[PDB]
Design an enzyme around this catalytic site. Structure first.
Site, PDB file in Angstrom:
ATOM      1  N   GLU A  55      32.383  33.717  49.372  1.00 37.01           N
ATOM      2  CA  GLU A  55      33.287  34.512  48.576  1.00 37.01           C
ATOM      3  C   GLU A  55      33.164  34.268  47.062  1.00 37.01           C
ATOM      4  O   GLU A  55      33.311  35.198  46.237  1.00 37.01           O
ATOM      5  CB  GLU A  55      34.708  34.215  49.029  1.00 37.01           C
ATOM      6  CG  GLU A  55      34.942  34.570  50.460  1.00 37.01           C
ATOM      7  CD  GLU A  55      35.211  36.029  50.617  1.00 37.01           C
ATOM      8  OE1 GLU A  55      35.271  36.727  49.581  1.00 37.01           O
ATOM      9  OE2 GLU A  55      35.369  36.484  51.767  1.00 37.01           O
TER      10      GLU A  55
ATOM     11  N   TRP B 292      30.260  49.492  42.488  1.00 37.07           N
ATOM     12  CA  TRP B 292      31.684  49.357  42.642  1.00 37.07           C
ATOM     13  C   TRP B 292      32.420  50.177  41.627  1.00 37.07           C
ATOM     14  O   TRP B 292      33.587  50.395  41.799  1.00 37.07           O
ATOM     15  CB  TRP B 292      32.130  47.894  42.588  1.00 37.07           C
ATOM     16  CG  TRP B 292      31.418  47.014  43.562  1.00 37.07           C
ATOM     17  CD1 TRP B 292      30.385  46.198  43.293  1.00 37.07           C
ATOM     18  CD2 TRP B 292      31.672  46.884  44.968  1.00 37.07           C
ATOM     19  NE1 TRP B 292      29.969  45.545  44.434  1.00 37.07           N
ATOM     20  CE2 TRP B 292      30.744  45.957  45.478  1.00 37.07           C
ATOM     21  CE3 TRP B 292      32.589  47.464  45.846  1.00 37.07           C
ATOM     22  CZ2 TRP B 292      30.714  45.585  46.821  1.00 37.07           C
ATOM     23  CZ3 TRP B 292      32.551  47.101  47.181  1.00 37.07           C
ATOM     24  CH2 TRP B 292      31.624  46.171  47.654  1.00 37.07           C
TER      25      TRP B 292
ATOM     26  N   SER C 249      39.770  42.545  49.744  1.00 37.51           N
ATOM     27  CA  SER C 249      40.235  41.917  48.500  1.00 37.51           C
ATOM     28  C   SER C 249      41.674  42.359  48.179  1.00 37.51           C
ATOM     29  O   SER C 249      42.571  42.133  48.979  1.00 37.51           O
ATOM     30  CB  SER C 249      39.249  42.211  47.364  1.00 37.51           C
ATOM     31  OG  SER C 249      39.249  41.205  46.395  1.00 37.51           O
TER      32      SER C 249
ATOM     33  N   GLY D 211      39.618  45.428  44.396  1.00 38.77           N
ATOM     34  CA  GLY D 211      39.424  45.553  42.962  1.00 38.77           C
ATOM     35  C   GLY D 211      40.617  45.062  42.174  1.00 38.77           C
ATOM     36  O   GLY D 211      41.163  45.781  41.327  1.00 38.77           O
ATOM     37  N   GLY D 212      41.029  43.836  42.478  1.00 32.91           N
ATOM     38  CA  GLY D 212      42.119  43.150  41.773  1.00 32.91           C
ATOM     39  C   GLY D 212      43.335  43.943  41.313  1.00 32.91           C
ATOM     40  O   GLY D 212      43.967  43.586  40.329  1.00 32.91           O
TER      41      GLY D 212
ATOM     42  N   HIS E 270      31.106  38.154  48.170  1.00 29.89           N
ATOM     43  CA  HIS E 270      32.398  38.785  48.272  1.00 29.89           C
ATOM     44  C   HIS E 270      32.146  40.276  48.365  1.00 29.89           C
ATOM     45  O   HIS E 270      31.249  40.764  47.695  1.00 29.89           O
ATOM     46  CB  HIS E 270      33.236  38.467  47.034  1.00 29.89           C
ATOM     47  CG  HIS E 270      34.553  39.176  46.991  1.00 29.89           C
ATOM     48  ND1 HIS E 270      35.493  39.056  47.988  1.00 29.89           N
ATOM     49  CD2 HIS E 270      35.096  39.989  46.055  1.00 29.89           C
ATOM     50  CE1 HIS E 270      36.555  39.776  47.677  1.00 29.89           C
ATOM     51  NE2 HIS E 270      36.343  40.347  46.505  1.00 29.89           N
TER      52      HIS E 270
END
Ligand SMILES: *[C@@H]1O[C@H](CO[C@@H]2O[C@@H](C)[C@@H](O)[C@@H](O)[C@@H]2O)[C@@H](O[C@@H]2O[C@H](CO)[C@@H](O)[C@H](O)[C@H]2NC(C)=O)[C@H](O)[C@H]1NC(C)=O
Ligand SMILES: *[C@@H]1O[C@H](CO[C@@H]2O[C@@H](C)[C@@H](O)[C@@H](O)[C@@H]2O)[C@@H](O[C@@H]2O[C@H](CO)[C@@H](O)[C@H](O)[C@H]2NC(C)=O)[C@H](O)[C@H]1NC(C)=O
Ligand SMILES: *[C@@H]1O[C@H](CO[C@@H]2O[C@@H](C)[C@@H](O)[C@@H](O)[C@@H]2O)[C@@H](O[C@@H]2O[C@H](CO)[C@@H](O)[C@H](O)[C@H]2NC(C)=O)[C@H](O)[C@H]1NC(C)=O
Ligand SMILES: *[C@@H]1O[C@H](CO[C@@H]2O[C@@H](C)[C@@H](O)[C@@H](O)[C@@H]2O)[C@@H](O[C@@H]2O[C@H](CO)[C@@H](O)[C@H](O)[C@H]2NC(C)=O)[C@H](O)[C@H]1NC(C)=O
Ligand SMILES: *[C@@H]1O[C@H](CO[C@@H]2O[C@@H](C)[C@@H](O)[C@@H](O)[C@@H]2O)[C@@H](O[C@@H]2O[C@H](CO)[C@@H](O)[C@H](O)[C@H]2NC(C)=O)[C@H](O)[C@H]1NC(C)=O
Ligand SMILES: *[C@@H]1O[C@H](CO[C@@H]2O[C@@H](C)[C@@H](O)[C@@H](O)[C@@H]2O)[C@@H](O[C@@H]2O[C@H](CO)[C@@H](O)[C@H](O)[C@H]2NC(C)=O)[C@H](O)[C@H]1NC(C)=O
Ligand SMILES: *[C@@H]1O[C@H](CO)[C@@H](O)[C@H](O)[C@H]1NC(C)=O
Ligand SMILES: *[C@@H]1O[C@H](CO)[C@@H](O)[C@H](O)[C@H]1NC(C)=O
Ligand SMILES: *[C@@H]1O[C@H](CO)[C@@H](O)[C@H](O)[C@H]1NC(C)=O
Ligand SMILES: *[C@@H]1O[C@H](CO)[C@@H](O)[C@H](O)[C@H]1NC(C)=O
Ligand SMILES: *[C@@H]1O[C@H](CO)[C@@H](O)[C@H](O)[C@H]1NC(C)=O
Ligand SMILES: *[C@@H]1O[C@H](CO)[C@@H](O)[C@H](O)[C@H]1NC(C)=O
Ligand SMILES: *[C@@H]1O[C@H](CO)[C@@H](O)[C@H](O)[C@H]1NC(C)=O
Ligand SMILES: *[C@@H]1O[C@H](CO)[C@@H](O)[C@H](O)[C@H]1NC(C)=O
Ligand SMILES: *[C@@H]1O[C@H](CO)[C@@H](O)[C@H](O)[C@H]1NC(C)=O
Ligand SMILES: [Cl-]
Ligand SMILES: [Cl-]
Ligand SMILES: [Cl-]
Lengths: 526, 526, 526
Positions: free
Chosen positions: C324, C81, C197, C115-116, C435
């Site tokens: 998740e 990621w 996300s 990625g928040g 997730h």
């Protein structure tokens, strides 16, 4: 800042104000039409020829000519409604409150003041848009429009005194917002009119005027509607009164236009004085010079247009206060003082009826007596009865009935029954939740901490403010975040309305069903 | 005033008239097309080349050529329908009545006169728009259109005599209103056609013509509809008759166009004379030269277009009179005089049938006899029976059936059964509520005080006038103010209609269900 | 070929790639805005001044600044990621994959990475549009947008740091596709956003932004929605954090604009370092700098807009994964390692709760304990419980609730519950269907033969790819050809969703009804 906006008419300087630790820009006193003077008195509002330079818009403008309520000199309760700027024939200005920082596409709220088409001004403290801008981040606009004879003198079809001039004022104010508000970041496409008493009635008239169809989006109607007994004048009285006024100032004539010429020359004050007298008898509620079927702004009797679905299709928010009637008792009902708790006798009740229904058949007054004085022994009976009579007949019923017929044509309508007595209310307990005494809660006055409304009250206002704001923005008067009561749509079948108060807001049905049957079905026949 | 309007064709002077203490401006005799003379006889109406100067529009114009009913010389009853201006080939003019003061955006009513496509003129006293303008503040327009051979001579697809010229006249009149009425303050967007007998039939044809789709808004149909037996002519008879007329004036030929050349040269009167003769046998109702499927104005047989929803979608108001049939009995039914109360014998009834249904099989006439003479002993039986036969077959059924099929395609339709006998009716009691005798109540003639209709009758007219007016304006024929009967929408299921009369107006179902089954289901098959 | 496209900005060279014996043209690294540097840091993305010449678009561009997850150096599971190109302030580029041969009017898919709002880049192997282009013959576009402080630093209403800059990036990327995709044969009229996300959350925000209304057609939301607890920041914290960041880099000030001036001058890395610290305590899920109610992109709190139907009306596809929560346990929950099978104690469970709900009342954490630890003796109980807690609260519930409220306003919505564990999943069995671990199946990675997913898995991907593709193209996520399960519309009443897995896909109701009642009804109140 120094903060200038470039209106399609010229520039205007605003003025920063502090609001709950925030800035709001206020543009007070912007002219929206060309002063209606001498030759223009009694005419439709005239275009504004673009001014050169900067207009300093930093104080409320002149209120319009009108008489002043002087029953209770020094009394806040009555005086808070009197104009707080110079009366003048020169009074077509409007205010804008944009929140700061200048917003992108804010929903705009336009206020229309009440006062029987006889009195009122936008500059009143209770109509202060500064809070609404701050809290809900909308633009608030209000305007002054001509009232009494000067704004509604009607000589049917005669372009010199065509009637409804004040209404056209309002409309021109709407056009103004239409052409300009964008410059302040307003969204002309999301515009909600709201008003109270004659204000509300005016809002409702705009729903009927084709001239206004496209000048706004939604509508809110607080204690008032055109179908109220006091709101529209028959083309007959309109004339009788225009003539009576003429006689009363030695203006009688042959060429009608000449009577206007004559009157165009008297002093405002000379007109204002006689206004009170153009009817045979009057009531505390007499709206001597009001809106008429001018075949221009109104193109046909409005009850017919309402009846047959001839109006803007859109959502509406409508409501009344628990005690609309009381406020008026003290301007003529025998036994009523703002000072004693006004217990009255059956004999006096009959007497009160004569005051509020002067022309009504002896039978007619008997029915009223009969319907309302069927007691459930209690001293206040007759006192409260006469209150409701005035309440129900002038406000609550025509209000409800408008809502009903309007929603029949397929639109969403919400109804509220405001039942909270401000704890800072200068009038006596017995007058209860009074006419016009929700306005302050709508404009969010109780949000001001150093102001001495209760906590209960701050909450309430915060809630209403939101509901209104939401209704303006999304056509739905919900408060979605603090676990509130859902506010049901008002259907013509079940007739649900939401009660507004500091304890619990409840959903209820068929407001004053018993009484309004009488006022709606029976009484128009006596 | 002196009052001039600037039409896209030139100027026209009107003329003030007094009406119930009010002014109405009348513009009588405005030309809307270019006189259809010599070379233009039998052609579609031609564009008006803008005139220079002022047109004085202050007298009704020439009625169009036609024969005159002379059964009862001196009799008002029959003569009130005869033209009251000079017959002329030069007759394409129209009238406008705008109320005064000039209105802003008035709904316009266009009248189309009846008279079997053979007779009629807009100038009739009973078609006087002056009252409607005064009372309901609308603009009323009426026009003259070519009738009989001169207006419907049909030589299918042959541009020299393409048929339906009179219909095109009407249409050009509509275009006129479309381009000009605004100048008089009319609103081209709210236009309601209304007519009676052939007038109604024409209104209905306009619902089908695409050429008209956009020239009006709503429609009213009084005693008549295209689907009536007398209203449309098959492309076959249309020819047989054009030829018969040719023979009858020595105009027979090889090059068809030549026959038109020939006929274009005869004298109006020579044509008018032979018209009566182009069919083998005729009836009191013979519409010798009428609308045909020209593939222009009508693009296909209209029953098919009606059947399959091929028409303007909009509201319609439709209705008939209690005794449509009687009026005709006196022009040929053995036993019937306007002078004796016309009791007739079974033998005579049979005789009457032969008159009204000449070509119909012996069986066919038997069925009619059989269905209608199933008595409930009473002398008038056969008299009334023959009335209804003509009534039901020519008017009431096709009327009802049109309404039915029209509402099936999702439009609001209202139906009335007019059942009041004017107390000033020059014909005898027995003819009852006669054909064409509601027109005067629609145009509000009984509103004229010094006129000797009854009080009952003044009310009634006032009501109808309003309902119509309302229907025009809002597509809803309600009278909302004087506690009236609600006028229900006519659904194809329940088939409700409103009765119109001086006593009580009632809501009823399935007008003449029994009889119309026969006329609609059975009889087209014999 | 050599293959050049003429964008309204300049030319760009693509590059052929082989895909399953086919060609796809890839245009990697096209700039869509003007590098946001120095003076432009923290501002809305700026217009691209047309470049002269050819742009070689043949390698992924720079990812944007961000921190890098270094819990498990060398571990694929976590590192897959991390960004795979140079971090840079200069990062506003986007990719396009058009299938070859250039298609006529292809539906376009736009990817938005998760990625928040703190991490992510379009260049990840798992976001490779090349397969989707090849297989379903659509155009796939993805872009990079600013994250963390650099993309969401918010100083409310202050145009220097107005907040939501990253969101505006995305939007400008959409405008780009709007103006240009046609040149590649894309159909701007059929555009479907999809993300995961924070990506999903962004997609959902676009449904609310009016600025985006017209920049796309449909929407897909994979594990995420704005209404998720982590997704939007209150205008209060937004500030607290902007200030905290200022203090933390000695940037505190008086003139707010100066604080931005200050910060505009620090080194990216100096900002990136302190980001972690602007909150009192954090969680594995802390989204320190995210979307805020800026009154620009978001014009009001979004839960209110969702609540009151204020969003693009269109179909949506929404769904989550079976587990998740697990992914996060390993970044702080005591007892959890990716290496031991992480059985934990009641004492540790309580401990885990403190980590994920730092600010939550002691009562609040008790309720969670109480609701989830009502066991059905089994060792893993507490382990799985804490998983679901995080799962249900951060993802699955807000996901479901969004879907619910959205479909209430009359749109078609489909819901999926993805429950398959990639057999190439580098993390341990216990973390289950993790997730973000459906992304690879959506982009069709298992379609690559020499890749070692199972046959089961190739099928599945092929199916999903199709359903998605179809949903994009026709707003219906059916697989119509291989006798599949019909995917029912998600109604707010019955709440059906489709399970996605290698065995049988089933239709089920009311996903996690029990738990989400708690999260939706009860917990927002503690
Ligand atoms: C219309 O007005 C007439 C006249 O009003 C009077 O004169 C005006 C100038 C003003 O001074 C008023 O106060 C006066 O009343 C009305 O006729 C009067 O009212 C009633 C008749 O119902 C009667 O008792 C008065 O004596 C009349 N006044 C005089 C002296 O003529 C009348 O009320 C109005 N017409 C209608 C029917 O509305
Ligand atoms: C209630 O008060 C009214 C109003 O009167 C005024 O205010 C009072 C506080 C008191 O100070 C009065 O003197 C003031 O005039 C009273 O109404 C009056 O009543 C008498 C007849 O009963 C009469 O002479 C006055 O003219 C009245 N005023 C009017 C115009 O109504 C009333 O009587 C009081 N009622 C009670 C019993 O409390
Ligand atoms: C079409 O017309 C023919 C001819 O009509 C006749 O001549 C015309 C000029 C006119 O003078 C009419 O009055 C005449 O009737 C019709 O044929 C006649 O009608 C019937 C036949 O059904 C017969 O009794 C007559 O003798 C015929 N006339 C003669 C002398 O030929 C016929 O009715 C029409 N055709 C159809 C079928 O519609
Ligand atoms: C009813 O009257 C008709 C019409 O006849 C005319 O008007 C009458 C008032 C009377 O004055 C008649 O003489 C007028 O001619 C009568 O119809 C006539 O009847 C006889 C045969 O019975 C016949 O010789 C006439 O030609 C008929 N006229 C026509 C063309 O029909 C009828 O007989 C009267 N019926 C009764 C009994 O009242
Ligand atoms: C907003 O921020 C203040 C200050 O945060 C502190 O300083 C920042 C620069 C950064 O270094 C943070 O890590 C610091 O915590 C917060 O106040 C702190 O947090 C709590 C108060 O609830 C307390 O335990 C700390 O001691 C406070 N820090 C100090 C030394 O003042 C506060 O949490 C935030 N305000 C709100 C209510 O959101
Ligand atoms: C499961 O493992 C965790 C994580 O510990 C790491 O990975 C393990 C494979 C092992 O090699 C550990 O030494 C590694 O540190 C264990 O968590 C640790 O537990 C003890 C207290 O019980 C503590 O001293 C460590 O600091 C803990 N680490 C953290 C930060 O949680 C855990 O105990 C293992 N649980 C079991 C019983 O399997
Ligand atoms: C308008 O008022 C403001 C008050 O601060 C001032 O700046 C400016 O000079 C004024 N312009 C005039 C005198 O019209
Ligand atoms: C403001 O909002 C409306 C939507 O109601 C939109 O059509 C209009 O163009 C907007 N103007 C802007 C972009 O500020
Ligand atoms: C809801 O109540 C909170 C206090 O808990 C307050 O901050 C907020 O303004 C309220 N919202 C509304 C719309 O009243
Ligand atoms: C038209 O008629 C009117 C009648 O009053 C008159 O004023 C005017 O002179 C006329 N014009 C002519 C003669 O055409
Ligand atoms: C008249 O009314 C119509 C509405 O049906 C309107 O569209 C038209 O513009 C109006 N013309 C005026 C303003 O007179
Ligand atoms: C209703 O009746 C009144 C008389 O009471 C009359 O003035 C009015 O014209 C009537 N309205 C209609 C539409 O008939
Ligand atoms: C761009 O890259 C390609 C690689 O094949 C090459 O053909 C071309 O020369 C390049 N142009 C430059 C140097 O920018
Ligand atoms: C592509 O498809 C759309 C239909 O959604 C169409 O309107 C557009 O013009 C098309 N462009 C072409 C012809 O490639
Ligand atoms: C359906 O399955 C067949 C294999 O039998 C395959 O060729 C095709 O790609 C499949 N279609 C989809 C949409 O999965
Ligand atoms: Cl109550
Ligand atoms: Cl009958
Ligand atoms: Cl599960």
């Amino acid at each position: 800042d120094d903060i200038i906006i470039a209106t399609k008419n010229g520039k205007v300087r605003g003025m920063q104000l502090t609001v709950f630790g925030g800035t709001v820009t206020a543009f007070l006193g912007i002219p929206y039409a060309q002063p209606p003077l001498g030759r223009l008195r009694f005419k439709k509002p005239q275009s504004l020829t673009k001014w050169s330079d900067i207009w300093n818009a930093t104080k409320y403008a002149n209120s319009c000519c009108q008489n002043i309520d002087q029953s209770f000199p020094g009394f806040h309760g009555s005086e808070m409604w009197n104009p707080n700027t110079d009366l003048s024939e020169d009074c077509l200005y409007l205010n804008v409150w944009i929140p700061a920082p200048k917003p992108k596409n804010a929903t705009v709220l336009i206020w229309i003041y009440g006062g029987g088409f006889q009195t009122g001004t936008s500059s009143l403290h209770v109509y202060d848009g500064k809070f609404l801008a701050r809290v809900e981040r909308v633009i608030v606009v209000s305007m002054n429009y001509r009232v009494g004879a000067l704004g509604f003198l009607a000589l049917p079809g005669n372009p010199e005194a065509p009637g409804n001039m004040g209404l056209f004022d309002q409309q021109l104010a709407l056009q103004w917002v239409q052409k300009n508000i964008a410059a302040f970041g307003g969204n002309p496409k999301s515009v909600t009119l709201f008003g109270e008493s004659a204000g509300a009635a005016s809002v409702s008239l705009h729903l009927l005027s084709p001239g206004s169809h496209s000048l706004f989006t939604r509508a809110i109607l607080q204690s008032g509607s055109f179908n109220a007994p006091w709101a529209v004048t028959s083309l007959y009285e309109a004339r009788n009164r225009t003539l009576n006024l003429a006689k009363l100032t030695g203006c009688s004539r042959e060429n009608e236009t000449e009577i206007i010429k004559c009157l165009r020359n008297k002093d405002p004050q000379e007109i204002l004085l006689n206004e009170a007298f153009v009817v045979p008898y009057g009531t505390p509620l007499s709206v001597n010079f009001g809106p008429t079927v001018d075949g221009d702004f109104l193109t046909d009797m409005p009850d017919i247009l309402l009846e047959l679905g001839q109006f803007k299709k859109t959502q509406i928010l409508v409501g009344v206060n628990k005690d609309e009637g009381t406020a008026f008792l003290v301007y003529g009902a025998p036994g009523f003082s703002k000072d004693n708790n006004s217990i009255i006798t059956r004999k006096e009740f009959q007497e009160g009826l004569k005051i509020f229904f002067p022309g009504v058949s002896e039978f007619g007054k008997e029915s009223i007596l009969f319907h309302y004085t069927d007691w459930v022994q209690r001293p206040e009976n007759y006192r409260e009865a006469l209150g409701d009579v005035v309440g129900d007949y002038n406000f609550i019923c025509p209000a409800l009935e408008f809502t009903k017929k309007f929603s029949e044509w397929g639109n969403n309508a919400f109804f509220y029954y405001f039942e909270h007595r401000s704890s800072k209310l200068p009038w006596p307990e017995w007058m209860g939740v009074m006419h016009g005494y929700e306005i302050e809660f709508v404009f969010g006055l109780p949000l001001e901490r150093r102001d001495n409304y209760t906590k209960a009250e701050e909450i309430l206002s915060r809630s209403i403010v939101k509901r209104w704001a939401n209704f303006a923005k999304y056509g739905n008067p919900q408060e979605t975040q603090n676990n509130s009561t859902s506010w049901p749509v008002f259907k013509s079948t079940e007739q649900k309305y939401l009660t507004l108060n500091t304890e619990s807001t409840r959903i209820m049905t068929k407001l004053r069903a018993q009484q309004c049957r009488f006022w709606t079905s029976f009484f128009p026949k006596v």
